[PDB]
Write a protein that binds this ligand. Structure first.
Ligand SMILES: Cc1cc2nc3c(=O)[nH]c(=O)nc-3n(C[C@H](O)[C@H](O)[C@H](O)COP(=O)(O)OP(=O)(O)OC[C@H]3O[C@@H](n4cnc5c(N)ncnc54)[C@H](O)[C@@H]3O)c2cc1C
Ligand SMILES: Cc1cc2nc3c(=O)[nH]c(=O)nc-3n(C[C@H](O)[C@H](O)[C@H](O)COP(=O)(O)OP(=O)(O)OC[C@H]3O[C@@H](n4cnc5c(N)ncnc54)[C@H](O)[C@@H]3O)c2cc1C
Lengths: 461, 461
């Protein structure tokens, strides 16, 4: 039984981040990974997605070429040209991450880990046993898919994982789901040329975001050529002579339901949710607490109900973002190996960017959350809607919407929500400001940068 | 002699901003303008420049089309197509600004204003006299040009004003100057297809910016095809049979000077400086203080040496930016008509974006200024240099450089400097943070947004 100071299960965003900071602090650490280092983000997440988003953005701007005095671009997009370059980039990143580990003297145990029946917390990878006074579970999650029992022919559709395996652009695609992953996929496919439909259970996408955003995003999707099928869901899917045939039910409130068949579908993409990767961990062997979805339960310090065992990242089911897994993993390493018992991550004011077209940026409370926390009487919001200067000379147009949520008489900025060109790189700084507890006065007393879209946020009235 | 509560001379950024805020406070105001409302920024500055920058950005991205799986774009840029659309946009803005004035009940006195010999401060516009207890001078400035006496044939070149009158793309252009206007002009002309040369007196451009920026910007200019002629200056210009012939002297330190002739130049653009517009104001009639450049001297409250007379904007020669003129103008209106005697603009931490390729963003002190203000021992800087993810799949590359200047043990962020894709919309928020007095810890405790370039600033080490 080989012993280490720190055993990290899962070589993804949180695991690697935690292991590397620990090693820096003098801990003898080891990382267990059954697949490719970098985890979900690097291999089938953030990275390949951003590359594809940059590709879609190229398509959109190509539509404006003539408006800007250039000759019209004619071409059909060649998917496998970009797919190959994308795959290669991911390969380079994998090699880099391995190198980072070796340089830090972190041992890499290749294989699938599971807890043993042994008294003191111990795991087994390929017959060999390993243990440590501190063990971190950062196994992440996977795409959720419907059961054939509930939706016949469900296994005929793909998930976001399959999306990155596609070698050709699907002629016709149907995406099911209304979360950020669904929105992003629909946006990329549509911009690249696929006749795309997005099937959502209600009337708007991203319903957990501020109402101004969900409303605006749904509209922009439609303006971009995406067919948004509201109040609908798949009843069954079947393989026809040429492609799939999707049977769906549309039940608009105050109306009679109606069944519809969508034929000649080349790609059915399920983007309905994520499930934690805890099934084959043998967590029961140690009695580690989980909820009914399989998420590991942790306190504010990432502690599980068992001493010496922690969890961070997607596996805990809260704030499923790479930077959050990373920050939580680092804060943990500092608390354990630098003995800063107050070291933990504040899950409030975590910023998010959704790579739609245009992109969405958000941080803090939505107007509704602020109203429930401070009371309608104490919440004031400021907002604006304009057409970015970039479209002053184009026939095609997109909008830019911004909303600031303030609380109390001091007008503390508790939330910022926006969608528009450049909003993806615009958010970070304001997020710092909001984390610092800025008030509207602080924003107002900052000289604007002109001409930009960002200056609108410091000149709201 | 018609009397008002507030008389504003100049209908540009600062003048209009001040007049409108004053009216809001109940003041009976009037604005004197001899030309087009909107001033320099709207008519021959920020606006038309940004439109042209967006056009140049289109050209750059078109070079990457093939790399992103699209068929190569072939076309020659058609200048007058964009010039006409640009002119029209400026026309719309002019109409809008006039409307804004009327709606606020601000009187517009068309004509050139000058102070009279009259005791109490009075001005005359087209024979009629006007007065007020408070008069604001916001006449801005104009492009500086060499005297024929010093540089023969100087009048053969154009200024930034002339640049916006160009109806065709110059085949060969030479820009003289090393400030932001020169850099921007060179960048646009070069990207649009003109064989461009930038003539600078020393070895780098933007020498008043942080050394990392001036160095990087000079390199990027060269990588973009701009011929940077260092340690050179024009000796004389003459009109030949086809275009201009520029005679220049290149005096590299530690070398013998050498004269060179640049033939077939279609456009010689002087971007050497700006002179204040105070010459025909008859300021002497009231003994208003100015420096030897013609700039009106003011205290921290925009007061001139004469009671009841103020000045803001480019005419005062400090921080020549539209947002600064606007903020100073508004702060003044609040002090005068809302009686907030402490109302004034803080000229520290004013953010600036230079629309180069890639764009530059800066706010606060450069490393050298921080060292002179706090001492080498108390100044710490953090920086990084990387290739934006957007170029992971392109043959063409640009870099992204970022530098954070911290002071004292607390590591207060006193300066942020960067250049790279997206930096134009990235700065505003960090500027708010810096204005609030953030420390490196505040930046470090803000969760990153991934994948973006902006996340690099909150993960510096
Ligand atoms: C399509 C999509 C796009 C996304 N885009 C973004 C974005 O753009 N920005 C963002 O911030 N987030 C994004 N996310 C979410 C981000 O990918 C995850 O939040 C992040 O990867 C979670 O980090 P993790 O450490 O918790 O898990 P993971 O990264 O998933 O790593 C878990 C690792 O554990 C390994 N593992 C599992 N079980 C064990 C075992 N029993 N033993 C050994 N190894 C094992 C898996 O192989 C894997 O590598 C994206 C998610 C996806 C699916
Ligand atoms: C090429 C260039 C690009 C620039 N790009 C930017 C940028 O991108 N962002 C930025 O922030 N800044 C930019 N600037 C600087 C910005 O244009 C000025 O900082 C800003 O216009 C100054 O405001 P002002 O109120 O002081 O003067 P102005 O805008 O110049 O207005 C002065 C007004 O006074 C009028 N006037 C003058 N004399 C009198 C008189 N005797 N009576 C009656 N009317 C009269 C003039 O007609 C004019 O309209 C740019 C400058 C230029 C030249």
């Amino acid at each position: 039984v080989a012993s280490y100071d720190y055993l990290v299960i899962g070589g993804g965003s949180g695991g690697l981040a935690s292991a590397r900071r620990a090693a820096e602090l003098g801990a003898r650490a080891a990382v267990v990974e059954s697949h490719k280092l970098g985890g979900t983000c690097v291999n089938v997440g953030c990275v390949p997605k951003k590359v594809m988003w940059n590709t879609a953005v190229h398509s959109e701007f190509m539509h404006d070429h003539a408006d800007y005095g250039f000759p019209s671009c004619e071409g059909k997009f060649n998917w496998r040209v970009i797919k190959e370059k994308r795959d290669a980039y991911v390969s380079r990143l994998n090699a880099i991450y391995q190198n980072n580990l070796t340089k830090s003297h972190i041992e890499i145990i290749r294989g699938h880990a599971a807890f043993t029946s042994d008294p003191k917390p111990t795991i087994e990878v390929s017959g060999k046993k390993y243990t440590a006074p501190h063990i971190l579970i950062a196994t992440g999650g996977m795409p959720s898919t419907p059961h054939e029992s509930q939706i016949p022919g469900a296994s005929l559709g793909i998930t976001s994982d399959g999306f990155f395996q596609l070698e050709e652009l699907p002629g016709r695609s149907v995406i099911v789901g209304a979360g950020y992953i669904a929105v992003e996929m629909a946006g990329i496919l549509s911009a690249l040329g696929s006749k795309t439909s997005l099937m959502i259970r209600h009337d708007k996408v991203l319903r957990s975001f501020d109402s101004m955003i969900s409303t605006n995003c749904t509209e922009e999707l439609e303006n971009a050529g995406v067919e948004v099928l509201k109040f609908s869901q798949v009843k069954e899917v079947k393989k026809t002579l040429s492609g799939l045939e999707v049977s769906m039910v549309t039940a608009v409130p105050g109306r009679l339901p109606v069944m519809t068949m969508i034929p000649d579908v080349d790609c059915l993409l399920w983007a309905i949710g994520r499930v934690p990767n805890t099934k084959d961990l043998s967590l029961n062997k140690l009695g580690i607490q989980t909820d009914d979805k399989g998420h590991i339960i942790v306190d504010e310090f990432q502690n599980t109900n068992v001493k010496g065992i922690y969890a961070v990242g997607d596996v805990c089911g809260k704030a499923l973002l790479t930077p959050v897994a990373i920050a939580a993993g680092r804060k943990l390493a500092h608390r354990l190996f630098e003995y800063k018992e107050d070291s933990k991550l504040d899950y409030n004011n975590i910023p998010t960017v959704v790579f739609s077209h245009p992109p969405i940026g958000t941080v803090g409370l939505t107007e509704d959350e602020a109203i429930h926390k401070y009371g309608i009487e104490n919440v004031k919001t400021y907002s604006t809607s304009f057409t970015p200067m970039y479209h002053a000379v184009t026939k095609r147009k997109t909008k830019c919407v911004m909303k600031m949520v303030c609380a109390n008489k001091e007008e503390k900025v508790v939330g910022i929500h926006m969608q528009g060109l450049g909003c993806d790189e615009m958010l970070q700084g304001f997020a710092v400001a909001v984390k610092m507890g800025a008030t509207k006065a602080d924003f107002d007393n900052t000289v604007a940068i002109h001409p930009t879209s960002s200056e609108e946020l410091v000149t709201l009235r």
